[PDB]
A paper describes a structure:
IMP dehydrogenase (IMPDH) catalyzes the first step in the guanine nucleotide de novo biosynthetic pathway, at the bifurcation of the guanine and adenine routes, which share the precursor IMP. An IMPDH monomer consists of a catalytic TIM barrel (light blue) and a regulatory Bateman domain (dark blue), which is not required for catalytic activity but is essential for allosteric regulation. The basic units of IMPDH are tetramers that dimerize to form octamers upon nucleotide binding. In contrast to the eukaryotic enzymes, bacterial IMPDHs only contains two canonical allosteric binding sites in their Bateman domains.
After multiple cocrystallization trials, we were able to obtain the structure of PaIMPDH bound to both ATP and GDP at 1.65 Å resolution. The two monomers in the asymmetric unit (AU) contained well‐defined electron density in the Bateman domain that could be unequivocally attributed to ATP and GDP bound to the canonical Sites 1 and 2, respectively, as well as a magnesium atom coordinated by their β‐ and γ‐phosphates. The binding modes of ATP and GDP in the canonical sites are identical to those observed in the structures of eukaryotic IMPDHs, 6 , 13 , 14 , 34 where the nucleotide's phosphate groups position close together at the interface of two opposing Bateman domains. The recognition of the adenine ring of ATP bound to the canonical Site 1 (ATP1) was mainly due to hydrogen bonds from the backbone carbonyl atoms of residues V159 and K181 and N6 nitrogen atom of the adenine. Additionally, ATP1 γ‐phosphate coordinated a Magnesium atom, together with the β‐phosphate of GDP bound to the canonical Site 2 (GDP2) and the carboxylic acid in the side chain of residue E180. In the canonical Site 2, GDP2 guanine ring was sandwiched between the hydrophobic side chains of residues F118 and V94, with the hydroxyls of the ribose moiety tightly coordinated to the carboxylic acid of the absolutely conserved residue D199. 35 The negative charge of GDP2 phosphate groups was counteracted by the basic side chains of residues K181 and R198, as well as a Magnesium atom. Monomers in the AU are related by noncrystallographic symmetry axes that allow to reconstruct IMPDH octamers within the crystal lattice. These octamers are assembled as dimers of tetramers that pile up tail‐to‐tail, forcing the finger domains of opposing tetramers to interact and placing their catalytic sites close together to inhibit the catalytic activity. Remarkably, no electron density surrounding the area corresponding to the eukaryotic noncanonical Site 3 is observed in the inhibited PaIMPDH structure, suggesting that, in contrast to eukaryotic IMPDHs, the occupancy of the canonical Site 2 by GTP/GDP (when ATP is bound at the canonical Site 1) is necessary and sufficient to induce compact octamers and, subsequently, inhibit the activity of PaIMPDH and EcIMPDH.
Author numbering:
A (entry chain B): 1 to 371, 381 to 388, 416 to 479
B (entry chain A), C (entry chain A): 1 to 373, 381 to 387, 416 to 480
The structure:
Amino acid sequence: MLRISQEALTFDDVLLIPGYSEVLPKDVSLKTRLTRGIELNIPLVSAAMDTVTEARLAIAMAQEGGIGIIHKNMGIEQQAAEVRKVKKHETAIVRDPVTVTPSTKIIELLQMAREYGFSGFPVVEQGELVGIVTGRDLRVKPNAGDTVAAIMTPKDKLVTAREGTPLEEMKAKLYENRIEKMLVVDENFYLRGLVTFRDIEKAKTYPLASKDEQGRLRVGAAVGTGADTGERVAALVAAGVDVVVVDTAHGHSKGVIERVRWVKQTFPDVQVIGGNIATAEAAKALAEAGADAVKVGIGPGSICTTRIVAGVGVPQISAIANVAAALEGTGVPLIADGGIRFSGDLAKAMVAGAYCVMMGSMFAGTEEAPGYKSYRGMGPEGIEGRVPYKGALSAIVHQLMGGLRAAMGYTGSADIQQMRTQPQFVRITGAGMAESHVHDVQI
Amino acid sequence: MLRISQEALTFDDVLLIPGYSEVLPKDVSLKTRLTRGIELNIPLVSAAMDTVTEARLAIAMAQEGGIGIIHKNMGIEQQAAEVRKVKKHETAIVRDPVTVTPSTKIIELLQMAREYGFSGFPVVEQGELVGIVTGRDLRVKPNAGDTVAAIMTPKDKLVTAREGTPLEEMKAKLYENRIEKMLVVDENFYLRGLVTFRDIEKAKTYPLASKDEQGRLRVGAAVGTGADTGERVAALVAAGVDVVVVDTAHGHSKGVIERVRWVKQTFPDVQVIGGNIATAEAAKALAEAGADAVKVGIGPGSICTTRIVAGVGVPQISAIANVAAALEGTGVPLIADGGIRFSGDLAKAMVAGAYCVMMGSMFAGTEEAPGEIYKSYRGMPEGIEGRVPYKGALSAIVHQLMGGLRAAMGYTGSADIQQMRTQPQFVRITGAGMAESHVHDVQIT
Amino acid sequence: MLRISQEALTFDDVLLIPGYSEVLPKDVSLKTRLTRGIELNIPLVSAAMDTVTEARLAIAMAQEGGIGIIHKNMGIEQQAAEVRKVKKHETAIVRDPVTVTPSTKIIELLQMAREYGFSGFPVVEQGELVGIVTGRDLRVKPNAGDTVAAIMTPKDKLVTAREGTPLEEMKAKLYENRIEKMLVVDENFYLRGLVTFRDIEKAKTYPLASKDEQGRLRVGAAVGTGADTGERVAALVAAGVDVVVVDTAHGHSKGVIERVRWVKQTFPDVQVIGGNIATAEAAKALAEAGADAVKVGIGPGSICTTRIVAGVGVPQISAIANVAAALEGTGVPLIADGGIRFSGDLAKAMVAGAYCVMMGSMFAGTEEAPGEIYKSYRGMPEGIEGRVPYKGALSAIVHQLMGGLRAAMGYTGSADIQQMRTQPQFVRITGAGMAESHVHDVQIT
Ligand SMILES: Nc1ncnc2c1ncn2[C@@H]1O[C@H](COP(=O)(O)OP(=O)(O)OP(=O)(O)O)[C@@H](O)[C@H]1O
Ligand SMILES: Nc1ncnc2c1ncn2[C@@H]1O[C@H](COP(=O)(O)OP(=O)(O)OP(=O)(O)O)[C@@H](O)[C@H]1O
Ligand SMILES: Nc1ncnc2c1ncn2[C@@H]1O[C@H](COP(=O)(O)OP(=O)(O)OP(=O)(O)O)[C@@H](O)[C@H]1O
Ligand SMILES: Nc1nc2c(ncn2[C@@H]2O[C@H](COP(=O)(O)OP(=O)(O)O)[C@@H](O)[C@H]2O)c(=O)[nH]1
Ligand SMILES: Nc1nc2c(ncn2[C@@H]2O[C@H](COP(=O)(O)OP(=O)(O)O)[C@@H](O)[C@H]2O)c(=O)[nH]1
Ligand SMILES: Nc1nc2c(ncn2[C@@H]2O[C@H](COP(=O)(O)OP(=O)(O)O)[C@@H](O)[C@H]2O)c(=O)[nH]1
Ligand SMILES: O=c1[nH]cnc2c1ncn2[C@@H]1O[C@H](COP(=O)(O)O)[C@@H](O)[C@H]1O
Ligand SMILES: O=c1[nH]cnc2c1ncn2[C@@H]1O[C@H](COP(=O)(O)O)[C@@H](O)[C@H]1O
Ligand SMILES: O=c1[nH]cnc2c1ncn2[C@@H]1O[C@H](COP(=O)(O)O)[C@@H](O)[C@H]1O
Ligand SMILES: [K+]
Ligand SMILES: [K+]
Ligand SMILES: [K+]
Ligand SMILES: [Mg+2]
Ligand SMILES: [Mg+2]
Ligand SMILES: [Mg+2]
């Protein structure tokens, strides 16, 4: 017998059916979950590819309400550093600010400012706050002396707040004193933190941003199953990563299942994603291993050769739906990874059961991406290619979310849970897809 | 008789001959002149086209050491306002700073700051300087009151410098007080100007910038010969334009010659460029009319169909050399306008005698050029409409163009622009030579 | 005045005129000179590009009767080591053979043989020759012991020849003893060298090979004018380089002229080439600086954008003839570098006066050229990056190039290179003539 399990469908095989709608696209909710423990304000994840996600793009994705997964084709220290870059970009309060002492030489401070990119340094003596020196102070060439003591704002002029003071109260004192740094101290005037105007303003600019409980942007990082995996995970957790993505070509394997279990056991406080998979049995296996989410996609990537080189794969719409049915009631989200060419595909991915969609090609070429711009597969199961320079990531995200919002309005879905569970597809033929593209007109 | 005056050559007809050299490309001088009275640190001018030069790109060109000519396909007041944007972008000292009164409401000031793009305002009541209010003050919600008086730095705390104080002693006092604005006053504490840290730093960031005597970036603006021209010139001069470009398809005409003369006589303190021309007799006519420079180019434009619609033109290498010969010894510069496709063409234009080169297509598509975007580029019928690829920041294109000129000067042994214009030699080539010059017989990656 | 020195011609502008001939292509001589002191059996040089010439291709070129110039985009020691690979590939006699001691462990020697690529080692203890150990001996696991002493051929069984013995009497003794290594000794049985059957056979297989006085293949190496140049030259000479190529974009400069003079004065026993140039005055300047040859070519390179980025160049046929005229009677050869697309171009270059021709693109993609592969070919910005088809063995390309030159010499009645350079004539043609020359009006299968 020719052993055929099912007919499997991809995005171009189906269209969403319009339904009665009372909620306009601009008014629907796009909030979803990446994992059991991480929420996203938009259902978008950037792929862990060396032409797509390093720190710069991961910051942008988090600011938009999604998240980026930093790729692993680099040294453990470099990946940890990239994760650190995202976590340190902004915060509710800098709890471990770089400090100087009164006898620190101004020349060191000038070099510190260059390397760090900021110029504000509390001045301490054995933990006790004794001054502050900032960019405007570093413009002063003092009459006498060559240390911080000669240009710092002295103790008697410091504006401070006690640990626990509300942010609004902290803001009023910042503005009244025409300063942009608030020194946070305890009852003995020991330095406990630093609040910056910049961080206040960044939070107001991106109120949708994906952040942890400390107000830091969220970020993920990929690991494999090779010999350096344990050391790599440890460095990423130490750098503050929110989610470790155990990311392989075949997640339904002993190696991946065992590594997912190991991360859950060794680092219980981090979220773990496992993949990639494309069947219900694989989803149950990874869920039983403790994955906080599964990533769905074997074959469909734009620059992916798996289906041609190995003959292996599952059309993505059916793969999503089979995984979603397997995980119904478990609380484990599924991330649809690969094959998204148009915003319309994203909407279809969501209606088939995805919680969020991972994309590579769509974000390759943006200003924030590493590096027309290069776009290559991470595998001999990938190819190297070119994508056009696309400008700022925000514009692509806006177009993708605009299409999803339009689809939710067309189907009457007011939020992601309704979009995932209520709308219906029609199955179409090759002719139906042609009618749905632009046809018979010069563009 | 078939009346043929000469054989005329264009860029692809000639190549520069290498010569014994002692100066490296990085060390040559690119300084030149746009007009009798305007110097440029690089020989680049952006074209007066509505897809190339408005204020944003003119600012960038001046910062790079060149200049932009603001186009005239817009209302008189709108063109003057674009000029004003360039002139007000930076300065050595703001001599007419916007001031407010103590009783001005904070909420009104907040909106003006949004509209003006700066938040620093000296506070004047009647004629007396009584405070200063800045962006950081405008963050304050005062316990009592809703006027500037409630959040301004008052008279007794103002940091000031007397008019004439060197700028290095003003900077020391700025830095000592951790402030970024210096109020300049006379002997009776009357406000005479405002110096900003931003302007100090902008000058340090772009030390090559093309600037006038007040430290303002230079800018030009195009005018035609139609009925509104007189008022347009007046409005542009009043806005501070450095050079008026009487810009027509045919500068060798009564219309342009008389208008150039009128500008020189009516506004003697502004520079005037006349064009476009392509012959020696035209160059002499404009010089006699008082032009401070001439613009050379009939036909060669990228988006130009003049040669095809009217059958008229002169290949640009010969046009440049003919005009340069006609103006030798007059002090009148010539600007080579149009036909530049590669940095190598720019070098050839200089050696043929150009003082600087005007370009449109190559700057269309930059971030600073007008338009949304893979950006539109159309002729200002004798022109066409088209698309060029989005090219990113202007600075990168300028860098490659000047790198090619620097290399050409190194190859010819030319240490500065004057030597490049007068000493190097061309060889004449065939179509085969041009093909050899270009990448040939290899797949390019 | 527009300063045009001449009309300059390239390959597609001219054709060779057939002349009365008595010598068949198969019978003409292709021998020529690379430099004052280096002869070549064919007029071919491979370019100093990182996609063309490292040791592997330089060996092949020398075996064919030409020479390779190893490129300089690599570390000083790495470039010297590439030179060493070529010089050590073959020899008349190995004068400094690697030796071992009786107590050297067999397992260590096995690894050294793997690293060295040969397995033949004279065995020396203190200063005395006491055995020889070879690949066949290293297959033996001795009953007792683990050192060379256990598997070597001992002193009493060594076959030796006295220094000076003709090579035909050494071969007879090699063959009589069914061995492939001859130990050369002096009057006190001290080791003076090692002769191998391989080297004997390599000389017989490539009787045209370009070799020095020691029977080693010739090789060149490129250097620039930067700060590390002095040490780079020293390292390359120490590795045995035959010719140093002071290789720059603009040889008519103080930088190159002074460096050429420095090489001639500091290392009088090495040949020095200077370039690149394209004029008579440049050729005389390099000859006066002491160059043993000049390299001609500014612009024509396949992957070269010099003409397009800088606007600089001289069509190659005229550049060759101008330099050849300048060097007539000096003894200084000229190498035509760049622009060769077809074997017919090579013939034209020779008749214009070249002594030999340097090529890059045509050798990129061969098995012997660097790189994996349908092979990369990029310029060493004034160059481009590209792809060329995988071309197989270098020998086949050389065979077709020399076949075309041989045919051209037969067509012109030129029996040798000196006659080809000095006697045949060109006709000047139009674009129509070039089109006629090329395959036209037929589908090609
Ligand atoms: N918490 C504070 N208490 C007292 N003085 C402070 C405090 N924070 C900053 N300052 C002082 O106020 C001045 C301005 O510092 P601030 O950190 O607001 O801006 P900056 O980063 O130096 O300037 P800019 O952001 O405009 O480049 C400096 O003299 C600095 O020492
Ligand atoms: N010449 C001056 N004399 C006295 N006080 C001044 C002067 N210039 C500015 N100040 C005051 O110093 C404070 C900071 O003003 P400044 O103009 O240096 O920066 P800003 O533009 O307000 O802040 P930022 O540039 O960081 O947004 C304000 O309280 C302002 O009133
Ligand atoms: N000059 C010599 N005198 C005495 N014995 C020698 C000499 N040269 C080689 N032999 C010996 O002859 C044998 C064969 O050595 P030879 O160098 O001819 O070939 P090989 O390189 O070992 O074998 P192959 O080339 O077939 O791999 C070895 O036992 C070696 O010790
Ligand atoms: N001062 C300071 N800022 C930090 C540190 N680590 C991260 N940051 C962030 O860097 C930014 C500094 O911005 P800002 O206060 O405007 O910098 P500055 O005024 O030029 O010194 C804020 O977003 C901080 O959260 C630190 O150790 N010290
Ligand atoms: N304050 C002020 N600046 C002006 C005016 N006209 C032009 N400018 C320029 O606008 C810029 C303001 O920069 P900056 O002082 O940093 O702005 P602010 O601190 O936000 O008020 C400077 O380059 C000034 O030269 C004016 O009337 N008032
Ligand atoms: N034995 C030996 N050969 C060398 C040395 N340096 C270069 N060669 C060359 O390496 C080649 C060795 O060839 P062959 O004698 O057949 O190698 P073997 O029989 O495997 O040891 C010859 O062309 C030598 O000229 C050396 O130090 N010792
Ligand atoms: O070379 C590879 N081989 C197989 N799959 C790949 C390779 N590189 C990336 N992928 C997958 O393809 C996804 C991106 O697909 P895209 O959004 O269609 O471009 C990634 O998130 C990976 O899951
Ligand atoms: O449509 C028109 N007809 C003829 N010339 C034009 C037209 N529009 C612009 N030009 C010229 O072409 C120049 C730009 O040429 P480009 O640098 O080759 O793109 C401008 O500076 C004008 O001199
Ligand atoms: O990028 C460069 N700029 C200019 N000339 C180059 C560059 N790279 C290589 N060349 C020259 O071009 C020659 C090869 O030309 P081809 O034989 O036509 O491929 C080299 O031997 C060099 O003289
Ligand atoms: K349609
Ligand atoms: K070329
Ligand atoms: K033919
Ligand atoms: Mg600051
Ligand atoms: Mg300010
Ligand atoms: Mg052997």
